[PDB]
């Protein structure tokens, strides 16, 4: 059972609703960060920042941000200190996001998949373990040190 | 996007070299941020940070980071202040990245595509204009203000 913070603008709103329901039915704990209603003009960043911020502050939790393509949404989430947000467009990329990147969040594009395909991506994301392999942690640590100082690490 | 900065560790190295040659042939000026040779044990974050820093610092340029899935790479690029790196897994997402997100960079997952498919993603990325539409700029501006200040914008 995993706690999952969800965020979405209008383009991901309907898919967010379905994911919340799906996560409840599969034994997880969805927390809705908004949008709470459909508003065709609303702006994704605030919802994605909210989901990623809450995810980072609640270790062990995951997050999912939803939009049209998911790309604006993952970009926004990645601006949050300590957040790692992959774009999941397949079961394989969702699983690898966890296994290799230890991503706490994924973005999904609601306009890119059927509901069936989106829920399978979610399933892979919420069940795949972080591998803890040395090279993966080393790379996470390098990026984290860059995030701390914004001093670009030298290339070999 | 005529100057194009590219970065990849070993996992994206061969595809990066193929893309550099393709960009030369289509009239662009690819700039290799590294890796300059295949080294099985190198780490992507420095190359992706270098590519994103140099892209953001160079008006009118674009950047591409290549990996296995591309997800670690776009996460790294997105930690650079001012950078917007989408994950492009199709011609449609590469185009939308420019049109909606004004993404200066994309990540591509070389293991997820044939070379032909990958070069077509690249073509869409470097030819699709930024829309300059009000709502898209408004969303970029909100994110840029969050990067400046780390005050999460209020949720409606």
* Residues constituting chain B: 156
Are A87 and B84 a contacting pair at CB < 8 A? no
CA gap B83, A99 in Å, rounded: 25
> How close does chain B come to A123, measured CA to CA in Å?
18
Residue A103: closest C-alpha in chain B: B72
**Three-state DSSP state, A11:** helix
Query: Quick check: A54 and A29 in contact, CB under 8 A?
Result: no
CB atoms within 10 A of CB B81: 12
CA gap B41, A5 in Å, rounded: 35
Domain that holds residue A9: 1-156
Chain B interface disruption, residue of A6, A136, A155, most B CBs within 10 A = A155
Strands (E), B9-151: 29-32, 62-67, 85-87, 105-109
Verify cis geometry, omega within 30 degrees of 0, for the bond prior to A35.
Answer: yes
CB atoms within 10 A of CB B149: 9
CB atoms within 10 A of CB A127: 13
In DSSP notation, A71-101 reads HHHHHHHHTSTT--EEE--SHHHHHHHHHTT
CA gap A7, B148 in Å, rounded: 22
Burial A97-113 (b: 16+ CB within 10 A, else e): bbbbbbbbbbbbbbebb
Element containing residue B144 per DSSP (H, E): helix B134-149
Query: B-chain residues within 8 Å CB-CB of A72?
Result: 86, 100-101, 139
CA gap B53, A31 in Å, rounded: 35
Are A143 and B45 a contacting pair at CB < 8 A? yes
Q: Which residues of B are catalytic?
A: 73, 100
CA gap B85, B90 in Å, rounded: 15
> How close does chain B come to A64, measured CA to CA in Å?
15
Number of structural domains in chain A: 1
Place of tokens 């993966």: A136
What DSSP designation does B59 have?
Answer: T
Largest CA distance in chain B: 49
CA gap B82, B102 in Å, rounded: 11
Query: Quick check: A29 and A6 in contact, CB under 8 A?
Result: no
Verify cis geometry, omega within 30 degrees of 0, for the bond prior to B84.
Answer: no
Q: Which residues of A are catalytic?
A: 73, 100
Residue B146: which of A79, A92, A150 has the nearest Cβ?
A: A79
Q: At B10, list the tokens.
A: 């070993």
Are B34 and A150 a contacting pair at CB < 8 A? no
Cα separations (Å) of A53 from A2, A36, A133, B82, B138? 17, 18, 26, 19, 21
- Contacts of A115-121 with C-beta under 8 Å, sequence gap 24+, read A115/A15, A115/A18, A118/A15, A118/A18, A118/A19, A119/A18, A119/A19, A119/A22, A120/A91, A121/A88, A121/A89, A121/A90, A121/A91, A121/A93, A121/A94
CB atoms within 10 A of CB B22: 16
Over the Cα atoms of chain A, what is R_g? Answer: 15
Question: In terms of DSSP bridges, do strands B105-109 and B85-87 run parallel, antiparallel, or are they unpaired?
Answer: parallel
Place of tokens 């030819």: B127
Query: B118: domain CATH number?
Result: 3.40.1400.10
């Amino acid at each position: 059972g995993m706690r999952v913070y969800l965020g979405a603008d209008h383009a991901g709103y309907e898919l967010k609703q379905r994911i919340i329901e799906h996560l409840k039915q599969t034994g997880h704990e969805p927390i809705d960060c908004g949008a709470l209603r459909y508003d065709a003009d609303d702006d994704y960043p605030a919802f994605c920042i909210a989901a990623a911020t809450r995810t980072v502050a609640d270790p062990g939790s995951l997050g999912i941000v939803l939009g049209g393509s998911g790309n604006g949404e993952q970009i926004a989430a990645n601006k949050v200190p300590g957040a790692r947000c992959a774009l999941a467009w397949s079961v394989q990329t969702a699983a690898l996001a966890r296994e290799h990147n230890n991503a706490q969040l994924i973005g999904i594009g609601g306009r890119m998949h059927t509901v069936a395909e989106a829920l399978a991506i979610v399933d892979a994301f919420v069940t795949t373990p972080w591998s803890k392999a040395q090279r993966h942690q080393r790379r996470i640590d390098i990026l984290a040190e860059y995030e701390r100082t914004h001093e670009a690490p030298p290339v070999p």
